Design an enzyme around this catalytic site. Structure first.
Site, PDB file in Angstrom:
ATOM      1  N   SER A 145       0.797  -1.218   0.000  1.00  0.00           N
ATOM      2  CA  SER A 145       0.000   0.000   0.000  1.00  0.00           C
ATOM      3  C   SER A 145       0.835   1.276   0.000  1.00  0.00           C
ATOM      4  O   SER A 145       0.262   2.351  -0.219  1.00  0.00           O
ATOM      5  CB  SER A 145      -0.968   0.004   1.187  1.00  0.00           C
ATOM      6  OG  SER A 145      -2.099  -0.814   0.901  1.00  0.00           O
ATOM      7  N   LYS A 155       2.923   6.702   5.504  1.00  0.00           N
ATOM      8  CA  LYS A 155       2.036   5.837   4.734  1.00  0.00           C
ATOM      9  C   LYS A 155       2.513   4.405   4.898  1.00  0.00           C
ATOM     10  O   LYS A 155       3.685   4.107   4.650  1.00  0.00           O
ATOM     11  CB  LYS A 155       2.008   6.198   3.249  1.00  0.00           C
ATOM     12  CG  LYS A 155       1.088   5.277   2.428  1.00  0.00           C
ATOM     13  CD  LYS A 155      -0.381   5.493   2.805  1.00  0.00           C
ATOM     14  CE  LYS A 155      -1.304   4.387   2.269  1.00  0.00           C
ATOM     15  NZ  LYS A 155      -1.349   3.183   3.154  1.00  0.00           N
ATOM     16  N   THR A 156       1.605   3.531   5.301  1.00  0.00           N
ATOM     17  CA  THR A 156       1.922   2.157   5.642  1.00  0.00           C
ATOM     18  C   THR A 156       1.546   1.185   4.526  1.00  0.00           C
ATOM     19  O   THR A 156       0.907   1.538   3.529  1.00  0.00           O
ATOM     20  CB  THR A 156       1.180   1.772   6.910  1.00  0.00           C
ATOM     21  OG1 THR A 156      -0.221   1.969   6.674  1.00  0.00           O
ATOM     22  CG2 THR A 156       1.645   2.647   8.079  1.00  0.00           C
ATOM     23  N   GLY A 157       1.939  -0.073   4.734  1.00  0.00           N
ATOM     24  CA  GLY A 157       1.479  -1.162   3.896  1.00  0.00           C
ATOM     25  C   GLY A 157       1.606  -2.474   4.631  1.00  0.00           C
ATOM     26  O   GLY A 157       2.423  -2.614   5.551  1.00  0.00           O
TER      27      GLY A 157
END
Length: 260
Positions: free
Chosen positions: A41, A205-207
């Site tokens: 992501s 921003k993560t994933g």
């Protein structure tokens, strides 16, 4: 030393990539900084910058609306799932995809920049010849060694954080809106943020692939003014589940804070 990151990697049961970068001084620390890792992501960060770049060129509007249909909804789409049969502004799609990782929202944005191939072309034009966007959600989560599709490197995505958040790629208004979205992120409270010291405003921003891979990329602004840091973190093929991998990302935050 950078050996600290190799020690952390051993406990993670996977492959750990870190780039901690300070543009104004040139300080850089990390591990496996030029290896390829699945973006998951975190691809939504360059996706949003491409959207804003297209808006700055007058070829797209943040108040342009996009229809939502039932077939667009995939798992983990908590805002877009409320708008089936009506529409949403491009600005709201960007917000949802970044701050809660709304998956359908990313799939609705991608055609507006000519899909994954258009995203890759935007990245190349701005100086990133490493990152490849190839697929939309959920197939972009696929990863295999030797397959560069939907991968980045810690160095490249740290470079992209610099380019879009601190450089001149976006207009002042677009760049500030992108930073505000990252600052407002709702998914990283147990990841890099939980290990980073007081005194720093974080946008990130993560994933996660839900199985063995977790990522977090961040800009770090000193609350008392001065030059920011960029921090990218990719953990792939770990034996730990999401909670354990979050703990690794937390410890990367701690190691990062010791170098700030």
């Amino acid at each position: 030393s950078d050996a600290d990151f190799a020690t952390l990697e051993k406990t993670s049961g996977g492959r750990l990539g870190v780039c901690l970068w300070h543009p104004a001084s040139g300080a850089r620390y990390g591990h496996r900084m030029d290896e390829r890792f699945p973006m998951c992501s975190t691809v939504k960060f360059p996706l949003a910058a491409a959207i804003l770049h297209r808006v700055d060129a007058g070829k797209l509007s943040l108040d342009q609306r996009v229809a939502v249909r039932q077939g667009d909804i995939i798992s983990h789409s908590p805002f877009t799932e409320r708008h089936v049969g009506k529409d949403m502004t491009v600005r709201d799609l960007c917000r949802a995809t970044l701050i809660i990782s709304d998956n359908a929202a990313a799939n609705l944005l991608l055609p507006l920049i000519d899909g994954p191939a258009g995203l890759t072309a935007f990245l190349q034009a701005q100086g990133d010849r490493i990152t490849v966007s190839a697929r939309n959600q959920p197939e972009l989560n696929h990863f295999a060694p030797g397959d560069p599709r939907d991968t980045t490197s810690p160095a490249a995505m740290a470079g992209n954080l610099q380019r879009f958040l601190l450089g001149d790629v976006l207009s002042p208004a677009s760049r500030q809106q992108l930073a505000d979205w990252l600052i407002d992120n709702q998914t990283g409270d147990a990841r890099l943020r939980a290990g980073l010291p007081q005194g720093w405003r974080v946008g990130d921003k993560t994933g996660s692939n839900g199985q063995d891979t977790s990522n977090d990329i961040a800009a770090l602004w000193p609350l008392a003014g001065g030059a920011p840091w960029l921090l990218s973190c990719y953990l792939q093929g770990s034996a730990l589940d999401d909670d354990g991998r979050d703990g690794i990302l937390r410890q990367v935050g701690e190691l990062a804070g010791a170098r700030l």
